[PDB]
């Protein structure tokens with residue numbers, strides 16, 4: 001038997017769904033994707049449940065201060081989000097010590113501003129936990145209640161758990177290739193060379209975005225083969241593909257991103273006021289998404305601020321990854337103008353059609369410049385032939401005002417003419433993740 005407990009709760013959307021409200025317990029036969037086969041005790045009702053709305057009975061996942069499955073970097077971002085207070089905290093699984101735990105606490109000092117401090121929660125051999133040897137606990141709940149009463153060596157006294165919203169409902173099972181009539185297109189968000197993007201409702205009860213490709217732009221079989229790879233590229237910094245309509249005009253259904261593209265955002269009243277540390281955090285988020293793409297031996301092929309999306313909570317998500325590969329070159333698409341932008345494209349991709357993760361790295365450098373200039377066109381004052389000929393002679397965009405030199409150094413490494421000399425996204429991810437926390441210890445060595 002495998003017994004579980006509901007963390008959040010939500011009611012029916014699909015066929016024979018269950019209706020709990022907040023706190024309830026149940027048993028599950030076995031797992032089927034992310035919709036587990038659910039059996040309830042004090043309900044007599046049988047159905048399916050969202051797997052991300054439940055957790056094991058006597059596991060930490062039931063606790064409001066435990067954040068399962070998040071990274072150190074995402075712990076810092078979550079805690080520094082608006083709505084959290086001094087001493088806001090979470091306990092999470094440790095990244096550098098398997099089976100152990102880490103405490104992350106929101107701190108403030110006038111010198112460094114808003115920071116997050118991390119503490120190693122060590123496990124005792126015969127049960128229990130401690131941060132400092134003089135203060136041991138039987139449970140993590142006892143550790144929390146202790147440090148809620150006084151800092152006792154921590155940077156702050158613990159106040160409230162990090163804020164968190166109910167996660168997105170998992171996509172309906174057996175709903176990969178969906179009928180076009182299941183979608184109501186409600187608001188056109190944009191028009192492009194090869195298609196449009198709509199805000200839409202799926203089956204009357206789910207908000208999504210739909211990219212509607214122009215007729216003649218893709219073939220069903222080639223797109224589906226590629227889309228079946230795209231849908232497996234699941235990462236918090238890539239936009240999620242939910243479903244496709246595999247008939248011309250092909251529709252691509254993804255999660256809806258309230259703030260549009262990063263280009264739109266940086267050029268908006270709100271985005272143009274983001275401070276430089278937030279711009280660098282955007283850069284780190286995209287680099288994390290690209291390091292995942294790199295790890296998966298995939299190629300974006302059209303990386304630019306216009307192809308980064310921004311959530312309501314300012315999460316950057318890579319969009320259109322791989323899509324350029326399945327846009328056909330024929331009489332229909334030719335009428336629409338340039339397929340890829342010269343100013344973003346690595347020279348070997350322009351000259352020989354050699355698109356690799358290394359030509360993505362080049363494009364990422366251009367994107368970094370877009371970010372720090374709040375969406376300025378690359379190579380201002382220069383035509384496309386001028387850019388190509390200048391690059392061949394070692395010209396690179398000069399460092400703009402309000403650009404840290406180390407960020408520019410990353411750009412210059414991305415813009416090596418020889419692709420092999422360009423860094424990995426794994427390397428870029430590490431430098432950007434640790435941009436300001438250089439010359440600092442990873443964990444606080446509390447006495």
Ligand SMILES: CCOC(=O)[C@H](CC(C)C)N[C@H]1CC[C@H](n2cc(-c3ccc(Oc4ccccc4)cc3)c3c(N)ncnc32)CC1
Pocket residue numbers: 189190191192197209210211230239241252253254255256257258259260261264306309318319320321322323
């Ligand atoms: C020049 C165009 O510029 C415009 O018109 C406007 C101008 C503004 C100022 C009005 N900006 C555009 C910017 C982009 C924006 N857009 C595009 C997508 C999307 C991207 C890829 C995708 O498919 C994928 C395919 C493969 C992999 C992953 C996803 C599905 C949806 C998307 C989304 N899911 N949620 C919100 N906005 C979203 C629409 C408006």
